[PDB]
Amino acid sequence: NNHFRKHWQRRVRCHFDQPGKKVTRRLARRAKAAALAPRPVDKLRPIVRCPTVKYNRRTRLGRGFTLEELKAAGIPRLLAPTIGIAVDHRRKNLSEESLAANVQRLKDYKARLILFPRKSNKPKKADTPKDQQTAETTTSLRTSFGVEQPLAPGFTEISKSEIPAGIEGGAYRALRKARSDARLVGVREKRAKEKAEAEANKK
Amino acid sequence: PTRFSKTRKHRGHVVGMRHFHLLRNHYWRPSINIDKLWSLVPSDVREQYLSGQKKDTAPVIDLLSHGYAKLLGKGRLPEIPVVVRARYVSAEAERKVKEAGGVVELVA
RNA sequence: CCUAGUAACGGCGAGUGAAGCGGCAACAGCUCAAAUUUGAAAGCUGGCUUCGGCCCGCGUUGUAAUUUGGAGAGGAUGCUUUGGGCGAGGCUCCUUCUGAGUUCCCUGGAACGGGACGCCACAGAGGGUGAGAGCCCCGUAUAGUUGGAAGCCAAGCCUGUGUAAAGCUCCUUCGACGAGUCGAGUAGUUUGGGAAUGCUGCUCAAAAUGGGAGGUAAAUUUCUUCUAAAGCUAAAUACCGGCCAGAGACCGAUAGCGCACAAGUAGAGUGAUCGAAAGAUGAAAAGCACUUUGAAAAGAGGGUUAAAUAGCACGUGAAAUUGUUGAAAGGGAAGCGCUUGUGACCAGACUUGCGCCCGGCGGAUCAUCCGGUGUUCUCACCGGUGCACUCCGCCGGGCUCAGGCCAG
RNA sequence: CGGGACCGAGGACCGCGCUCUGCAAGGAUGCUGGCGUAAUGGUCACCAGCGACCCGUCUUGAAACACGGACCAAGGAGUCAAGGUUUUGCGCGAGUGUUUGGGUGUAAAACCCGCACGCGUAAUGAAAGUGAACGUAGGUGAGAGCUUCGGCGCAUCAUCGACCGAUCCUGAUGUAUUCGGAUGGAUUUGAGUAGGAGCGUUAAGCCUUGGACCCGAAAGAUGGUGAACUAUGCUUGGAUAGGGU
RNA sequence: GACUAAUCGAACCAUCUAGUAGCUGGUUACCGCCGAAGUUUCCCUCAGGAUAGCAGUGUCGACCUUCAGUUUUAUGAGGUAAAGCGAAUGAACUUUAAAUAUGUAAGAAGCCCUUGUUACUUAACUGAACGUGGGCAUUCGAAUGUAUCGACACUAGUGGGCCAUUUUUGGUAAGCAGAACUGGCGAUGCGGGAUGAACCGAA
RNA sequence: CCCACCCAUACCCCGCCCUCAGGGUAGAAACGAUGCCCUGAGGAGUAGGCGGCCGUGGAGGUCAGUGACGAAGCCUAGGGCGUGAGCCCGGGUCGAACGGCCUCUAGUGCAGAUCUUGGUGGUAGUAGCAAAUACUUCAAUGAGAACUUGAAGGACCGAAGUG
RNA sequence: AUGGCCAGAAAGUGGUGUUGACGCAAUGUGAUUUCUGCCCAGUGCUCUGAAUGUCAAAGUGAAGAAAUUCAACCAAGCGCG
RNA sequence: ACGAGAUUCCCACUGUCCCUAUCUACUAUCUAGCGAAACCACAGCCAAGGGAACGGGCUUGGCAAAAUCAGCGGGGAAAGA
RNA sequence: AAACUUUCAACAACGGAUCUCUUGGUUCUGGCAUCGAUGAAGAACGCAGCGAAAUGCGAUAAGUAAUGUGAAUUGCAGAAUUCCGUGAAUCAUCGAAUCUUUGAACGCACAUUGCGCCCGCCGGUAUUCCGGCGGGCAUGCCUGUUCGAGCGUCAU
């Protein structure tokens, strides 16, 4: 299995510039941090659950918070990207757990947020006062607001008295019954119409 | 290295069905036997259970957190009750767990 | 990066070959058409200006404001939001300036070599200077320090305040959303999508909870996802062209680019095009005055150089091949192997060492004892003690042993 | 009992012995002479006796034929990458792999970090799917090593069994009375289980694909340049004594 | 099939392009240790293939069992020579028995005995097969030899060549043509046949 | 038929080299233990396989390495070591760098390829240098005159010319 | 001549063609003299003469819920005459 | 009729022979000057033998004396072979 | 014996190998975004006291201005530099200029230094003739201005 039957030597890519590109990326990150100081270098990201059954056991960072999440957290959608909150309008909240977790995340960020006034001589009501403007700050929201518990806890201790009785008939038999019912859902409903029609005809 | 080659020494002398759009994530389901089930418990806690200092506590093991979807039944288990949460289980695995004194719960 | 040489395609098989998820780099969002401003085209190109404006026009077959599906429009409702002007200070780019031996001796034509004595080092990278120089020179390291311009960022501080616009919450109602386009057949081409791909041509040609997709053809009943046929947008990504720069376990003038040189030159071809060879005197020309022989080129003396055994044929100067000198062989080949011989020319080896017995000198680092010190803890060294029948050197004699080559 | 040739390996003693003050007994000593240098020895040139085809290369079984070689200097031909496989060394070990990336740096070095992921830890079946202990992880015969001397028996081999998946037959208790598939059988099958062995890396050998050890063909294709030679045609020019019939 | 710039059954130039060749030529120091090969068997042959065999490096296993291109013994093939027929009978007669080489067998891993079953077989529990238990170590049941074992892994060349003795099958006017074994050669120097691929001696 | 004699790398005895095999060697006075000591056998080789060593360009370490009182290179009827590839020294020449040891690395070793580039031989002072009718005398110039000039002679082109 | 023979990728393109059967184009033979062995009807040349026999795409009908299937009709050429 | 087309014969004519001889010019030759190339494993006397029908080198013989010049066309070399 | 051929050695030749060098290649890495009708890239022709080329430049021609440095250039010739300076230099920087004929190349052409047209200025006796100088004259397309055409639609 050697795919060398084309003119492969004309598009061979080497990577001698790997440390130089790392140096260039680090210089760009330092310049971005110096330009964005005292704001963090990145935006706040929500916690979302990965698709498919292979990866639905793990959570990660998403693109941006939903409009419903921002509305529940009390942050207007025009203010949100101006104070370092990423906003996604395509994502929806199909369940209450992820919505509540992201609302709590937004509330923690808003509680830890320091908002400087646009004009220093005229502070506003929603603006952080100068005597609380000084504190120890963070510049990495991916570090200070990462995914703390990506997977579920793999070990838990319970007392011997509260051991559940489990599914009657066994877990293996329950799985087999579920598969059999899923395969036979249509035929049983068809013979249900057939029995109903026979009863209506010969009532 | 060129000096170690033999050429320097030889100088001077020369079926079934087709599946369109297969997605492996549908069929992702790694399996673990019951004789490696106690290895998922942390080592100190596992040694306490195996010594017998915990006679009133039963460990709950989530296979999906460790990366397993099915519990298979190769090996034997000690007489310690264990709670196992798994997507799939085999008949012999559940039988051996119930002989050990625990229960296999089904999750998704 | 992984998925993955996998799903998939493929005569008579050689082969071909993605995508979702996941981790990361980088992250940034928006603008129209479809609405009546209708109590006032509120919009704009151009021309002339006294810089206040005024005209010629474009445009109602639609230029502004408002709305773009995430919504919005209309209501209700009560709160919040905004404009200018300085600006300390900081950063980017050119500019002035930066440590220490030419101390003594030897070799040498010349010290930058060897020896001795110093010094500087946030500088012992590199180069030059008559041979290997941190301190002779340029530079090199580091903080800064002179002078100048143009930008950007920016802690703060002065003032206007609501005519206007803007945000938030809720809602009966309304809620326009791109057509020869989508889609279908067919043909060509393409793809892993030769049942599930895309593009184009011809023919047909839509709809309003409609339409597209949901990788096996079709009908029926559901469900899930977006919202095409209009448009803009940094970054992470590519880079055998250009410009500036730094490097290398690369090549060292038949190598390395064809080209280290007046090289894409000389030269060839009608032309498209083809396309070389060729670096090094010496530290410094000090590149040979003057005399003599030649028509001249040059030769010989004689200087120059550290060297002409470096003479602009020029560092070093191999081999093939040639000339002279010296030695030798040769009656239709030479060359080679074994073994003598002759001639020529050479490397070794040897020159005496060691041990006793006397005699004559020069000295007391002889044995024992005491103290100090170190060690392997019983062995040593150091300082006093020897008083010459004891130790150590030197010179004369004698003896033994071992010594080179060839032999009986 | 004589006569002659060639040789002297070893390097305290030990041993076997004898003819036993010692010896010819597990390998040469003793005495003497000349010379102490080109005398011995060596190198080169040449003569002499004997010996001796010109090298590759190719062919088949081999020669012969053929082909290359005037001479000398400098280049000058099994390399690199990717992916396998076996063996060697190394680290860790049911795990292993820091280097896509991040941190850091005296800055392409070195050092540090972890999520995912790759391979391994489970197989079989076209698929739906199911999924590896009757037994001190079994019996018998060997088997190194150990043993309390009764045996215990590593690795490995032969053989009979046991379990898992696929195939075929029967069809139990139960029941959405038509779902479910227990139990008992029979053939093969799988590098399957039956007290894990792998992952990374180094070195070497061989394939496999790339120009693939080096030098060559008649070719094929894409885009350009030529009628100054020559061929034909057009326009406009030029040229060809003296005789015979 | 003439000419188209010394180029024409398809001009010249550059590029794809280092195109392809199975065919030709070449392929670079030394020493040491081993060291070969030509129908064996299968495939439709030539413009064919694998494969057996023969080798080298590593290892590992108790390098354990010993085996052997040999002789002897027993028994086959060759009964063929031969002796006798005052043994019978008449190479085809036999008491006996040739030479050359040649097949099989010659132990504790073996030999029997006993018990059952049999789905084998036999008229048959009868033979034998499979198991079961026991007896045989008193000599392990000829000679000679024995640095000669076994099993993997990886790697390589050669695998329908030449000559000769013997045996055998066909032939020709005479030449000769197939096979089977063995030896030599290709891979090999030395001594002798004056000389030399095939001779003799000896490596 | 008989006696004697000649000699092969064959056979016998001895020495030395290599390979293989079998033994010994620590309360270490003890060793490039990867060493040393003892004993025996064997020695051809194409294709092919394997091991060890020599050499070249460059890199890390090291030798307190060599060197203008002469590095590298080159020449040598001059020597020493190694079976060998090779290594080392003497002498001459020359002018600025270079080597040993252990590892690392490769564009690493030539007699051939009708090679590639450059240089040089024998042939060999050889083949030729012979179409177009043809040259001669004096003087001058000059170092030098068949092929320069002037004069003097002789010729040729022959008007589709040597104009 | 709404032609023939050519050419061009195509063109509101070009040539023959400033042409018109005493012409243009294509063939074969090759002055003059001589000259057509005798007769056909197998291959071929050409006749829109009847047929649907073969019969493509488009178009038409039937079945089905549709994909689809089945039917006729079916140009030229071929076939028949 | 015409023809640098192919063929047979006759008269004339003669150096085609028979049968060769002689003359001229330019070469070849020698000298002065100038001066290559092809080719070249190494070399060049033969005879017999050298199994593979081939010797130049081997074996056994004949032999065999420096350095050369003009010619020649047997080998050996030599044909863009 | 010499000559000749061959062998060995020394020196001298021929030739340019070897060794050492290296203002050059080759490969990697980092940074930057900037050609042209306001006339590019390329081509030609010229320019120095004494140059053919390379280099630089354009009739302001190995060059001008400006800024900076501060005493050269060099092969010869000739001049310097008030050195206590508006200043050497084949110096550096570079913001102002010059920039021949061409070329996308632009009046029409170009194998010609060919032929024009429009408008100004100057000179020669010149209202007429002659000469010189300066500024212009390509194409496609856009916006606008102005002059127009057409029973195409109307009003009057």
PDB file of C-alpha atoms (C1' of nucleotides) in Angstrom, chain D residues 50-119:
ATOM      1  C1'   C D  50      64.397 -23.854 -14.448  1.00  0.00           C
ATOM      2  C1'   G D  51      59.226 -21.972 -14.610  1.00  0.00           C
ATOM      3  C1'   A D  52      55.492 -18.721 -16.859  1.00  0.00           C
ATOM      4  C1'   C D  53      49.517 -17.145 -22.987  1.00  0.00           C
ATOM      5  C1'   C D  54      46.697 -10.591 -22.566  1.00  0.00           C
ATOM      6  C1'   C D  55      43.291  -8.625 -19.339  1.00  0.00           C
ATOM      7  C1'   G D  56      38.291  -8.556 -18.923  1.00  0.00           C
ATOM      8  C1'   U D  57      33.314  -9.285 -20.478  1.00  0.00           C
ATOM      9  C1'   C D  58      29.937 -12.848 -22.983  1.00  0.00           C
ATOM     10  C1'   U D  59      28.276 -17.700 -24.312  1.00  0.00           C
ATOM     11  C1'   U D  60      26.945 -22.465 -23.288  1.00  0.00           C
ATOM     12  C1'   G D  61      28.399 -27.692 -20.438  1.00  0.00           C
ATOM     13  C1'   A D  62      32.905 -25.663 -22.054  1.00  0.00           C
ATOM     14  C1'   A D  63      36.392 -23.634 -25.636  1.00  0.00           C
ATOM     15  C1'   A D  64      36.644 -20.895 -29.994  1.00  0.00           C
ATOM     16  C1'   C D  65      34.284 -16.660 -32.101  1.00  0.00           C
ATOM     17  C1'   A D  66      32.928 -11.835 -30.794  1.00  0.00           C
ATOM     18  C1'   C D  67      33.178  -7.036 -28.229  1.00  0.00           C
ATOM     19  C1'   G D  68      36.281  -3.090 -25.261  1.00  0.00           C
ATOM     20  C1'   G D  69      41.371  -1.549 -24.122  1.00  0.00           C
ATOM     21  C1'   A D  70      47.478   4.151 -27.743  1.00  0.00           C
ATOM     22  C1'   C D  71      48.998   6.503 -22.762  1.00  0.00           C
ATOM     23  C1'   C D  72      48.281   9.508 -18.159  1.00  0.00           C
ATOM     24  C1'   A D  73      45.716  12.752 -14.474  1.00  0.00           C
ATOM     25  C1'   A D  74      40.922  14.114 -12.168  1.00  0.00           C
ATOM     26  C1'   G D  75      36.165  12.083 -11.644  1.00  0.00           C
ATOM     27  C1'   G D  76      32.511   8.072 -12.337  1.00  0.00           C
ATOM     28  C1'   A D  77      27.704   3.878 -10.954  1.00  0.00           C
ATOM     29  C1'   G D  78      22.580  -0.456  -5.230  1.00  0.00           C
ATOM     30  C1'   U D  79      21.459   6.058  -2.854  1.00  0.00           C
ATOM     31  C1'   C D  80      17.237   8.590  -0.276  1.00  0.00           C
ATOM     32  C1'   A D  81      12.136   8.620   1.381  1.00  0.00           C
ATOM     33  C1'   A D  82       7.461   6.042   2.674  1.00  0.00           C
ATOM     34  C1'   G D  83       5.255   1.433   4.212  1.00  0.00           C
ATOM     35  C1'   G D  84       6.067  -3.873   5.604  1.00  0.00           C
ATOM     36  C1'   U D  85       8.750  -8.368   7.673  1.00  0.00           C
ATOM     37  C1'   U D  86      12.594 -11.059  10.642  1.00  0.00           C
ATOM     38  C1'   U D  87      16.587 -10.589  13.865  1.00  0.00           C
ATOM     39  C1'   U D  88      20.058  -7.425  17.581  1.00  0.00           C
ATOM     40  C1'   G D  89      20.422  -3.625  21.512  1.00  0.00           C
ATOM     41  C1'   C D  90      17.628  -0.230  24.847  1.00  0.00           C
ATOM     42  C1'   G D  91      13.475   2.062  28.005  1.00  0.00           C
ATOM     43  C1'   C D  92       8.785   1.123  30.093  1.00  0.00           C
ATOM     44  C1'   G D  93       5.394  -2.737  30.663  1.00  0.00           C
ATOM     45  C1'   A D  94      -1.076  -4.209  30.481  1.00  0.00           C
ATOM     46  C1'   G D  95       0.124  -0.732  29.032  1.00  0.00           C
ATOM     47  C1'   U D  96       3.002   2.323  25.706  1.00  0.00           C
ATOM     48  C1'   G D  97       4.050   6.736  22.524  1.00  0.00           C
ATOM     49  C1'   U D  98       6.635  14.452  25.501  1.00  0.00           C
ATOM     50  C1'   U D  99       7.968  17.214  20.250  1.00  0.00           C
ATOM     51  C1'   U D 100      -0.316  18.300  16.117  1.00  0.00           C
ATOM     52  C1'   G D 101      -0.131  21.808  20.030  1.00  0.00           C
ATOM     53  C1'   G D 102       1.063  24.567  24.793  1.00  0.00           C
ATOM     54  C1'   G D 103       4.741  26.311  28.480  1.00  0.00           C
ATOM     55  C1'   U D 104       9.723  27.699  28.672  1.00  0.00           C
ATOM     56  C1'   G D 105      14.575  28.882  26.802  1.00  0.00           C
ATOM     57  C1'   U D 106      21.459  30.883  27.430  1.00  0.00           C
ATOM     58  C1'   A D 107      16.446  30.546  21.241  1.00  0.00           C
ATOM     59  C1'   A D 108      15.788  25.914  14.925  1.00  0.00           C
ATOM     60  C1'   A D 109      19.132  23.030  20.816  1.00  0.00           C
ATOM     61  C1'   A D 110      17.824  21.492  25.776  1.00  0.00           C
ATOM     62  C1'   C D 111      13.952  21.092  29.650  1.00  0.00           C
ATOM     63  C1'   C D 112       8.747  20.698  31.094  1.00  0.00           C
ATOM     64  C1'   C D 113       2.944  19.872  30.204  1.00  0.00           C
ATOM     65  C1'   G D 114      -1.556  17.323  29.126  1.00  0.00           C
ATOM     66  C1'   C D 115      -6.626  16.440  26.487  1.00  0.00           C
ATOM     67  C1'   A D 116      -7.683  13.655  22.632  1.00  0.00           C
ATOM     68  C1'   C D 117      -5.639   9.942  19.402  1.00  0.00           C
ATOM     69  C1'   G D 118      -2.730   5.576  17.350  1.00  0.00           C
ATOM     70  C1'   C D 119      -1.398   0.426  18.478  1.00  0.00           C
TER      71        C D 119
END
